[PDB]
Every structure is written in C-alpha cells, then in structure tokens.
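Reader question, answered in our methods column.
A reader sent in the components of a multi-part assembly and asked whether the whole thing could be modeled at once rather than chain by chain. We filled in our standard form and ran it. Here is what they sent:
COMPLEX SIZE: two components
ENTRIES:
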Amino acid sequence: DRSEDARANAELLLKGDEQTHKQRMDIANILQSQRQNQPSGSVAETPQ
Amino acid sequence: DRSEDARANAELLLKGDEQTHKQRMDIANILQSQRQNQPSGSVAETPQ
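And here is the structure of the entire assembly that came back:
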C-alpha cells in the first residue's frame, strides 16, 4: 500500500507538468482572440 | 517511499520553471490587449 501511495502522489505531479502548459496555451489563445476582438469591433461592434 | 519522494522533488521543481513562464506569457497578452483596446474603441466603440 505504501509503495503505491507514494507512486500515485508523484504520478499526479507528472500530470501537473502537462496541465501547467495546457492551461498556459489556453489562456494565451483566449487573450489572443481578445486582441482580435478589438479591431473587429471598430467596424461594427461584436462581443468577445 | 524516499526514492519516489526524491523523484517528486524534481517534478515540483519542473512545475516551478513552468509556472514562471505561464506568468510571463499570460500577463504579456493581458497588457497587450489592454493598450490596444483604447485606440480601437476611440474609432467607435469595442469591448475588450
């Protein structure tokens, strides 16, 4: 039990390495679309 | 336990490097869209 307890602790940290970059790219692209909203809204208003 | 805990220290350190870059990329796009919003909305109006 104790071997697989410590194994599952650090396995979740391995998924944490993937999730930090996943959230990074998602937030960055949402903010990229937020930048594209602003010229498009100049011609005629459109929400984000 | 201590072998896997040792491996976990390295994974926590990798997340430390990742989370710094996540803070650099996200903040950069927030500020870039914030400065561009004001000239765009001066043409007519646009939300951010």
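What stands out: The CA atoms of residues 38 and 44 of chain A lie 10 Å apart. The radius of gyration of chain A is 20 Å.
Send us your own complexes using the same form.
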